[PDB]
């Protein structure tokens, strides 16, 4: 559906957008094609709104640090998982604007996939959020937003 | 014809990124430790590229000291697309022009090619220096382990001259002051001319120390400094007995223009 993201796709791709998202209130929801299948529809109706794109890469660098700590970097891979929660809303706690409604389709999917990691595996239980974190960015570039 | 071997002068030390240091790939990083590094390709090809133009300027003033510089005359071979003619920059790589002598007996007397080596058809001269990859020092492994930033993301812009419309981009560069540990091995294949090769390598090091290394450079992204540790000699009998029979030059607090010379290398002269 390359022609979807039409102008009413915000009023079309929010049929069940947050229900199954809140049903994925842990990280390891479903290893299958449901990850990519959810990750397309998440970015499918962000694109009709603004979604200022390049305010994400601090989480990318932080996941790189935690991934170096997967590669025998540090034994404590707990503090950087909490530092994302320290920076979870500071962005919408800094300045607002036109693309805030897409942030309404971004903040509701944070705490389902962010309150999990206190008693989690540090190396494991992490790759599926790590895949949803990139497939949304990827298909959002592919629909034409960046 | 006649490759010999007397020993191997080893140059060790540190490379000080006095300003930021860009070598693109995002700066390169080795896949295992994850830290950035300097390759030896990026460094040999920048000592060479400077000593090239140094020879090209003095191309007529040396041809009684270095023969087979008589067979060149300055410039590129781009305004007449031939391989080997009277011009100095006589090899096409892909679409660009670079001086490599085409034979063994021609390149044995080239000052560039007896030190950085050459190639060719039906003859080949191989190098005398080995320029190894330069990883971060012992201090900066741990400054990385203590949580510091080893790289930065710098943001630049491009301004329209008429309306001041500006257009940003992001570079990613090693932070200033970062220090990499290098090694350069000159393989003493002739005891007649090792002074000239060590002195030409120091000329290339000095010209690199006034220019940049990688990256934009004309905008500040270079500025490498060479902090010397040890010239060593490792003669032909170090490798057989194993005993510490190698001559060391004491230069732990000197400049690349301060080595360049008779006072330092006197025992290497006497050891021949």
């Amino acid at each position: 559906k390359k022609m979807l993201e039409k102008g009413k796709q915000w009023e079309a791709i929010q049929p069940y957008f947050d229900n199954v998202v809140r049903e994925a209130k842990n990280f390891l929801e479903w290893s299958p094609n449901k990850r990519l299948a959810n990750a397309v529809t998440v970015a499918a109706y962000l694109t009709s709104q603004g979604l200022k794109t390049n305010q994400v890469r601090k989480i990318l660098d932080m996941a790189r640090t935690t991934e170096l700590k997967v590669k025998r970097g540090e034994g404590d891979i707990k503090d950087d998982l909490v530092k994302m929660r320290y920076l979870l809303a500071y962005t919408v706690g800094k300045a607002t604007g036109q693309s805030k409604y897409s942030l309404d389709a971004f903040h509701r999917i944070l705490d389902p996939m962010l309150e999990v990691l206190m008693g989690s595996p540090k190396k494991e239980n992490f790759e599926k959020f790590y895949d949803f974190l990139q497939a949304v960015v990827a298909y959002h570039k592919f629909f034409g937003g960046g | 014809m006649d490759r010999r071997f007397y020993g191997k002068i080893v140059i060790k030390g540190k490379i000080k990124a006095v300003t930021g240091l860009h070598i693109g790939s995002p700066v390169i990083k080795d896949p295992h430790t994850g830290l950035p590094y300097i390759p030896g390709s990026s460094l040999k090809g920048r000592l060479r590229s400077l000593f090239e133009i140094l020879v090209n300027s003095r191309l007529g003033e040396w041809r009684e000291k270095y023969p087979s510089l008589a067979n060149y005359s300055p410039g590129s071979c781009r305004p007449d697309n031939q391989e080997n003619c009277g011009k100095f920059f006589n090899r096409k790589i892909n679409r660009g022009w670079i001086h490599v002598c085409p034979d063994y007996e021609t390149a044995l007397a080239c000052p560039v090619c007896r030190l950085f080596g050459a190639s060719g058809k039906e003859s080949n001269f191989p190098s005398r220096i080995i320029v190894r990859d330069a990883f971060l020092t012992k201090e900066w492994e741990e400054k990385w382990r203590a949580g510091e930033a080893i790289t930065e993301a710098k943001i630049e812009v491009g301004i329209d001259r008429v309306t001041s419309q500006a257009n940003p981009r992001t570079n990613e560069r090693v932070v200033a002051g970062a220090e990499f540990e290098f090694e350069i091995i000159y393989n003493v294949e002739n005891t007649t001319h090792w002074r000239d090769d060590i002195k030409n390598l120091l000329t290339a090091m000095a010209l690199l120390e006034d220019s940049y290394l990688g990256g934009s450079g004309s905008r500040g992204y270079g500025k490498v400094k060479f902090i010397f540790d040890s010239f060593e000699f490792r003669p032909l009998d170090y490798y057989r007995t194993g005993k510490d029979e190698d001559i060391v030059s004491i230069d732990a607090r000197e400049k690349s223009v301060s080595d360049i010379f008779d006072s330092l290398f006197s025992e290497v002269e006497g050891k021949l």
Binding site: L36, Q134, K141 | -
Partner: protein, 248 residues
């Protein structure tokens, strides 16, 4: 150097069905005369009304550079300019479909060798790739060497080349407009093709293609109805010819 072997499949079943010598003699002479006679007339450049659209890298020359080593009862062994051999394999297939009524088929194993290579090895690569393109399906073509967790059907490749090729390849070794200076887009896609052989089960190769075309893209359960391989796997032998015949 493009070295094509390749013969008519299941022909002994066909000759074991003739019920007189007058019938066997006709069938054997026609199968003989296709390879003895009507294969040089192809390489001259004839019969284009019947052959027509083929995967071709360049406009067909007046005097092509192809050497027929043998062409006999059912088989051949042909060498030549390694990207005029490519058009000739599909062109000989399209003419053998027409010479028969469609009833008989041929396999082709292909090899692209450096010009100064021993001939026992240059023959045992192609003779092995013919058994490889033959024990699979007996209507196949081994287009190019390929990695997998290998051959193609004829009509499968000629349906691919209608689609994937004319959007990236202009003609005579030149890519399309503005996909020039994007040659690295064609090789790195074969990187994204090679995260599929490393694991066909991981679905990471879809968003990476969507990212790289943003800077093939989606999966289908038509492949996963019976676990046949995805469409990102059927692009090696279509991109790889265009890369070998544009500036490598």
């Amino acid at each position: 150097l493009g070295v094509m072997k390749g013969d008519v499949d299941r022909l002994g079943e066909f000759f074991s069905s003739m019920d007189s010598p007058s019938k066997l003699a006709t069938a054997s002479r026609f199968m003989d005369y296709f390879f003895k006679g009507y294969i040089g007339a192809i390489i001259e450049g004839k019969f284009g009304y019947i052959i027509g659209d083929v995967p071709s890298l360049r406009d067909w020359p007046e005097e092509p550079d192809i050497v027929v080593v043998y062409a006999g009862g059912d088989a051949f062994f042909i060498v030549g300019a390694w990207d005029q051999i490519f058009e000739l394999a599909f062109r000989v297939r399209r003419a053998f479909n027409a010479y028969t009524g469609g009833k008989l088929t041929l396999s082709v194993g292909l090899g692209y060798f450096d010009e100064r290579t021993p001939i026992y090895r240059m023959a045992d690569v192609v003779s092995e790739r013919l058994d490889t393109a033959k024990d699979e399906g007996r209507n196949r073509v081994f287009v190019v060497g390929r990695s997998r967790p290998l051959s193609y059907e004829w009509n499968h490749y000629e349906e691919l080349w209608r689609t994937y090729a004319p959007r990236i390849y202009a003609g005579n070794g030149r890519l399309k407009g503005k996909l020039e200076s994007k040659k690295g887009l064609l090789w790195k896609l074969l990187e994204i093709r090679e995260l599929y052989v490393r694991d066909p089960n991981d679905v990471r190769w879809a968003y990476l293609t969507a990212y790289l075309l943003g800077r093939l893209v989606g999966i289908d359960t038509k492949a996963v109805e019976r676990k046949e391989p995805q469409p990102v796997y059927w692009v090696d032998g279509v991109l790889k010819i265009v890369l070998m015949a544009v500036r490598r």
